[PDB]
Assembly symmetry: C2
Homo-oligomer: 260 residues x 2
């Protein structure tokens, strides 16, 4: 067990003694379903009970903590859904805990809510950014692996043998390409069964290949967990590269990052 | 057990004594994954062993039978993938068994291969069409339910409670619409784990709704198996309407077909 992982368990268990968890899964593609699956595995393994966020329900501004699911939606100039959800609901809760996330911009949101945010960063670029906004390391800003590294992998495996050479899993926007991230895409991941079975699908697909080529973070993560030979390609805002440098480098020697 | 269902079991078991099964799952959307899941359930429940079709492998023109998975791909003027697969591979096998399917046109294919085809029709329009091509009922043309009615439903259920009113699952081509059929879409369904877990996803989604509105056949079928209130809408070539009249009318009184 890594030092950041043990710290993460004890920390969330410490919050659970004091406040009850109101959990909102991050919406998005099937990669975001992998984060939710692993988050549900994390809650069950640490005996952490939660109530799912219900719009219109009244929560306690003193004893309820919003657990905002991990992901990379908080990117100014790209997505505004996660930013709008937090800003419209920050007043309802005592604290807002952002599960391990990639954050870019939205400096006004984090400076003006520093007293309510507890930010978990899944790579060094987000960690240095948040701490540069005067967040205090080990008090209201932390760094640790993306949730998907917590995936209880053995209950998702099909154990079907490898018989195909290369899988191409590239973003459809810009050969035999299978963008398996874009299968289920939306605000689905508050259903733990749908999240886990969607994650089984992605894993079932990858299990049968020896080599995986992708620019999709959680395809790369899943294939790395599977011990596959992984060729990971970059995207904008250093999103892929930063997670690779923090979590995949050296820890998974069969996964390499192709810069050019 | 329905009379057509019992006939179907004994018939395929009879073929299995004489020849070995080479199975090709129908490619397509997640509806076609439901057909494959149910076909795998059907094989396991009847102790029917098979070998998956492998392109480039040599099969016996005397003792191997191609089992072509059910579906609605054989529609002239719409799709040609299933037609090309059968025509290019019909010479390799002793017989070609078409699992319960909707067929439109391609009269040249069925007239010129009448001595090798055993056609299972999943509604009355296909059955009357094939038999009009001089196929002999109960010898080389049969009628029975779509494979999805064979789905071993209880191993797919999440048992999550109902808490949402209406689900809209309409074809994206032409409100809160979720075209869950277009999640996994391709030649995936020869993997039984991927087929079953994709089917779990669709079922997980539908379980939480009380009413389902759709023009997607296997969404309507799945929701009917779930005992939901189902509003089923038509499409072209009488594809939805014909399956409804044969399999869903009266047998599932909470599913109704909206003509206009």
């Amino acid at each position: 067990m890594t030092n950041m992982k043990l710290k993460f368990d004890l920390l969330l268990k410490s919050y659970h003694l004091s406040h009850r968890f109101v959990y909102k899964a991050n919406p998005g593609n099937a990669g975001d379903g992998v984060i939710a699956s692993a988050t549900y595995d994390f809650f069950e393994r640490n005996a952490l009970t939660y109530i799912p966020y219900r719009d219109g329900e009244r929560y306690s501004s003193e004893t309820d903590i919003l657990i905002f699911g991990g992901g990379g939606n908080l990117i100014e100039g790209l997505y505004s859904e996660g930013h709008d959800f937090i800003q419209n609901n920050i007043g309802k809760f005592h604290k807002v805990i952002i599960m391990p996330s990639t954050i870019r911009g939205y400096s006004d949101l984090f400076i003006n809510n520093i007293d309510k945010f507890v930010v978990f960063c899944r790579e060094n670029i987000t960690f240095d950014y948040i701490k540069s906004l005067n967040y205090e390391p080990n008090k209201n800003v932390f760094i640790t692996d993306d949730m998907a590294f917590y995936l209880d992998l053995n209950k998702y495996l099909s154990l079907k043998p490898v018989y195909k050479k290369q899988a191409n899993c590239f973003r459809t926007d810009s050969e035999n390409n299978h963008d398996i991230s874009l299968t289920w895409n939306g605000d689905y991941w508050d259903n733990e069964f749908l999240a886990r079975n969607s994650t089984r699908c992605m894993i079932n697909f990858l299990e049968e290949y020896k080599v995986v080529n992708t620019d999709r973070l959680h395809v790369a993560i899943l294939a790395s967990l599977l011990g596959k030979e992984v060729n990971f390609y970059p995207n904008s805002y250093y999103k892929n590269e930063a997670v690779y440098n923090y979590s995949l480098f050296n820890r998974y020697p069969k996964t390499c990052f192709i810069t050019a």
